From Swiss-Prot, chain D:
The protein, known as: Putative capsid protein V20
Coiled coil: none
Protein localization: Virion
Species assigned in the record: Sputnik virophage
Cited function: May self assemble to form an icosahedral capsid. Most abundant protein in the virion.
Length: 508, 508, 508, 51, 51
């Protein structure tokens, strides 16, 4: 429309209803012959160690990225004296289920070696701050549906009680085409009575960690291996699997349930080896993207409650490279939850509300200090936060209508910030999303306890994900970081032939 | 960038905040004038079949893809002796609503002949299976909304009576921004008493056949039509359109309702014809994608009750050309559902849970034997299945809180597996998923009844969908399957853009 | 695929599981250093007008598009005679919340001025209909989640309690991962009794005006400006921020409140900035898309009630150019809703159901004539209406099952049709969206009130939205409308590439 | 124990082959054996046919 | 009766037992982070031991 300011080109476009003329080909979709599903039953498993050794049938077989283990289980709980108490059954229609995600929240460290090169991630802590963060609605009803997956939205189970979003509800009570409560996940009960409860079922869980994936869409698999494996080591306390609502217990029982003994029977993983058609060849040595989770947790004893405000800091921690992303959040500290059976079961995994976060990049301070805590949300949802602003900063007020009564406040499970490091910190140049090395950061954020009932010693976490490339050939598994010279990055050409939105898709 | 194993090419992108500067065009939309909508009233509508003879206004007019038929009805119920009593009214607050979607499940076949070549479908069997596979809540609240659209997520209505997701619940009782259960759908009740009822309203529904679409997205409307016609032939029973729950009926048990009488007033189709500008001209003979749904059914004498497992042999079936995809699902055998009015109204749509399937081909034998039933759900969901894994494979527990009642088991919906052919099944070399050859499959599949109340009699369905081109010209029309040749498909040149994921979306 | 009518060119694509080889390339994402958020507290804010004046820190900084204001507020209520009494509190558990969305709802005109040229929208009217129109479930839980954003679907708040989709309700009672009801929004309750209530929080509203945005995608920020300023003139009545339910209060007709007063404290904008990394140069003069939203309405003296039909003409409102979109809906008349406080606080914001809209275009009398109400809605969800159809045209019965008091109906929110103007209305030859000429338009549509409680008078709106390039360059804010020529459109070379499904994404 | 098995499943090398056994075992039992082979390996289970 | 008998003191030689990346050695510099989380059982019968 060469009438505006500086002139510009016009193209015409066709409405969807009628094009109708354009060279329309027909695309024959070919995938290699003889796709197969293997089922390796773990050999060597204990209550504390699952141990699969699973090799590919050949070189030339390209195994698929989505892996997942299934595992049959057997739990028994026995009522405690002196309560008491107690009239009623030991399991309750609203009070209990499994903790999402059962299998991971127990695993100390999952571990796997692609082709003789050891790649591992720590599952226990990282996973709950990993759940909140990249799944929309569509994906939550897709693959991730296999383990209990509903997230902890109430600050303490006791308050949620009977509610329509209550995490531990039955199958009824969750609207249509919506995320189910964890009570709805099937298990069959041999006996449930006062004094005793014995239940049994089957638990699925997808192996998390790169270069495998729990995103829906997927890319090309890892030909050409000769070796593969998996090893999960589990915490010895192993009672963390169950979740229970405080409502029943009263004061000084304190609670009915403890103790309980969980047991496993040999689990078995499921791999999918396709093999390509003879006519079309795959290359001899091939490359893949590969990320890597790293965590440092800092604990300071001081205890704020029920709702005081304070400030914290972390010891400086040097890094060897800019990491692609970074996650900051204050959790209810781990050390206090572990002692005692009562406590381990009946505390949801939630975060404190961040009044303000200020952090320093390397030898540089004051970053993000000025931005409103509500602003923290704005640029993080853009990262993909998927949770109503209301639950981030969580605390909500419902007022009751009867004279001589005070209104009651409800704690709501705060948020977790994340700031893609070229996106939301900005970088002096030339520095990239990968370049080595040696930058050092520390964080100092001010939090507020919102939980209405318990004093909470807190803690801070920082998860980074370094980025690099893992090249597999038979038989090698070279991996790098840095990958680009600090000079070569300063003058690489910006191409308009991609959409920054394309790089959101490669999680991560 | 060169620094890992093999050197890799370097490019740099702009963060989305500062994407300027790139040359930016002003795009002018040119979509031809005269989008109008005609309302053809049926001539020769009887009690048994409606018929519409509706021709385009002129040559030169593109008839758009979405079409739908509105139909005013009338129904009367009559409480039967001697089930009495018989207290309160026949229609209840949340006890009943239209079976969804109604006038499609009644129709025996709908057949539309585009331009002197007939394109026919058999809906009564096909519909429910097709229904699940391509809905993303956003799409199921779009066009899919017009006919009551909520499918039964319970094995028996009985148990679901107090429940938030109840498939036939009143408008109050749906979550905000979600699917609404069939009790929502509006219509005037002239009377409701004990001993009689009568209801009157106009209910829509689309033509579901290919071509024409229920999928939201849309593409090129079929020009240059010169003739069109639609025939609906509906089954005798009719009583099926209504649904209703177990609890209310009693003690024999025999329901309150039977018998009842439906009617139809003159109906009417509704379709629109955009017409191009003289400027931008359209080709004299053009080609459209054309799928063809075909279904094969077997019946087994043998019963299982009410949660005992069994195996089944799918009957043999020789095809001419590889089907693009195919859907197998066991379900409750029809004949039973038809005999007797109450029985006919009472029982839902749902299937039995597939414990494992093992299909064969023409000498590739046992394919898919070892893949866990869970593994089955996975590859299916990638083709779009769209429901939590918990409700596929549906059995769920609700544990009871009172001493010392047993805990009750709820069946849900048996799943339906779908396997795109090039994708999961693995073709022999050089023949893709369209080509003409003689191949015959069988699908032996073991499956369990999970519904607690009735003995199931089973039946197995296998719905295949073939892919071909249909050239509509002026004047004549022409479809041909197996459009590619085996020597051709062997060596066809391989392209990167656009990749497959985008490709599937044209449905399907 | 040579052998089906006209030979079709035939290429092969690769599956997902095996990309496997395709030239992959490491990509440095380099976006400039320095993203920071300055908050500008509004000097000279009062109770009735806010005034910000936000200056650029320096040249060379892009200003990030997404802007939002954050106001702290304070309200006190009072019980009146003589409805009382009246026991219980003023504030009820599920009977009252903010009107969604509160702060803008009150605003007469939100006006800004970029770089010395003033652009404004009239917010109070526009907002509520331009609210339904472009959000999915994914986006309403994204940004828009900062204000209360659940929309009024009930024709009166009377019926809404108690139900799990009632707009004004407690946070619990919303099913997992869905639009939260408006009573969720957090805010402190200083005191609550019979005769007195008082609340004090802080609430945000993202600024709804182009070029600035409020939906998902994110696009290039405006550089380079030297001045920027805003001015909201709040409507004077300023009791419309709150909302009530009618169920409470006397059969006599009198309300609980009473009166109330509102007061704001200091309020403050939050602008993003970032300074482009020194090496890459942003061009001196740049150009952005911009849309001018304008509205007109016509009043009517006679009234209809409670559910009978009527028809209306609209006067000839002459649009100066052809706008991109055009909206049209019949709203309950303002002249009445602003009187008597009680009337002002307690009515929702919804529409009378359109039965047939038959409008006259540029020299055509009778475009869209005989398309069924159903038929109109179809083609508007391709403009992303989003809300389910049964809510559009809203009427919904609800039978009870007790003897023998006849069943109740419920009014539901009526739709608001929208015709995209080059697409759905169909345009002259050689003329297109941008093209500027003087054209007369006057709608004529019939509407039936569905709400069964009150007499309604009808306003009618017609909100257009134009298209023009605006060329920022310090210091000038050059604007245009109608940049393509009546000639030029003729022979604009049809090109794709460019996808129409992408074009529905660049929306304002 | 053959008479009690509902089904015996045995997968080899990753491809599962199984035989139902409650009733299929008695058909196969009378059929192919002769005296000299009946009295060999098949001597371990109490294997004399009900006549 | 049960006797507590003195807990252990674990010592891992750093390069040898812990494992160490390419081009790093016993006296190279500098700046790596270290964090250790081990779990302990008290054995001493008589006294409550703060640790």
């Amino acid at each position: 429309m060469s009438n505006s300011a500086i002139p510009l080109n016009v193209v015409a476009v066709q409405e969807p209803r009628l094009e109708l003329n354009n060279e329309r080909t027909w695309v024959v979709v070919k995938g290699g012959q003889q796709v197969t599903y293997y089922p390796f039953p773990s050999t060597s498993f204990s209550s504390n160690q699952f141990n699969f050794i699973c090799n590919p049938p050949s070189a030339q077989t390209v195994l698929d990225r989505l892996v997942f283990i299934q595992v049959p289980y057997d739990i028994t709980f026995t009522a405690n004296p002196s309560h008491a108490g107690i009239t009623e059954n030991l399991l309750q229609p609203g009070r209990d289920a499994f903790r999402a995600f059962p299998i991971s929240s127990i695993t100390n460290t999952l571990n796997a070696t692609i082709n003789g090169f050891p790649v591992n991630i720590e599952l226990a802590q990282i996973i709950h701050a990993l759940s909140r963060y990249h799944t929309p609605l569509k994906v939550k009803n897709g693959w991730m549906s296999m383990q209990p997956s509903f997230e902890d939205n109430y600050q303490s189970y006791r308050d949620a009680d009977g509610a329509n979003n209550n995490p531990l509800g039955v199958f009824t009570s969750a609207a249509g085409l919506s995320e189910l409560p964890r009570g709805s996940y099937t298990m069959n009960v041999v006996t449930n009575t006062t004094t005793t409860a014995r239940i049994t079922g089957v638990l699925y869980e997808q192996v998390f960690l790169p270069p495998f994936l729990w995103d829906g869409e997927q890319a090309g698999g890892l030909a050409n291996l000769t070796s593969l494996t998996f090893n999960w080591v589990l915490n010895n306390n192993l009672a963390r699997i169950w979740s229970h609502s405080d409502i029943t217990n009263d004061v000084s029982g304190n609670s009915t349930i403890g103790s309980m003994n969980i047991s496993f029977q040999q689990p078995s993983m499921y791999l999918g080896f396709v093999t390509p058609r003879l006519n079309i060849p795959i290359p001899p040595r091939i490359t893949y993207p590969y990320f890597k989770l790293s965590r440092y947790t800092t604990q300071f004893q001081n205890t704020l409650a029920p709702n005081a405000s304070s400030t914290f800091k972390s010891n400086v921690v040097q890094l060897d490279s800019i990491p692609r992303k970074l996650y900051l959040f204050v959790k209810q500290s781990d050390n206090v939850i572990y002692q005692n059976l009562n406590n381990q079961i009946t505390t949801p995994d939630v975060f404190l509300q961040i009044n303000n976060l200020n952090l320093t990049w390397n030898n540089q301070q004051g970053i993000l200090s000025g931005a409103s805590s509500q602003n923290l949300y704005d640029f993080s949802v853009q990262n993909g936060y998927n949770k109503t602003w209301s639950e981030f900063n969580g605390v909500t007020q419902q007022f009751n209508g009867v004279s001589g009564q005070p209104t009651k406040v409800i704690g709501l499970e705060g948020g977790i910030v994340c700031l893609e490091l070229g996106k939301d910190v900005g970088l002096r140049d030339d520095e990239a999303e990968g370049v080595i090395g040696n930058f050092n950061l520390q964080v100092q954020m001010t939090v507020t306890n919102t939980n209405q009932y318990v004093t909470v010693t807190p803690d801070m976490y920082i998860v980074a994900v370094y980025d690099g490339t893992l090249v597999i050939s038979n038989t090698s598994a070279m991996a790098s970081i840095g990958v680009a010279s600090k000079e070569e990055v300063l003058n690489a050409r910006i191409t308009h032939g991609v959409s920054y939105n394309e790089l959101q898709r490669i999680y991560g």
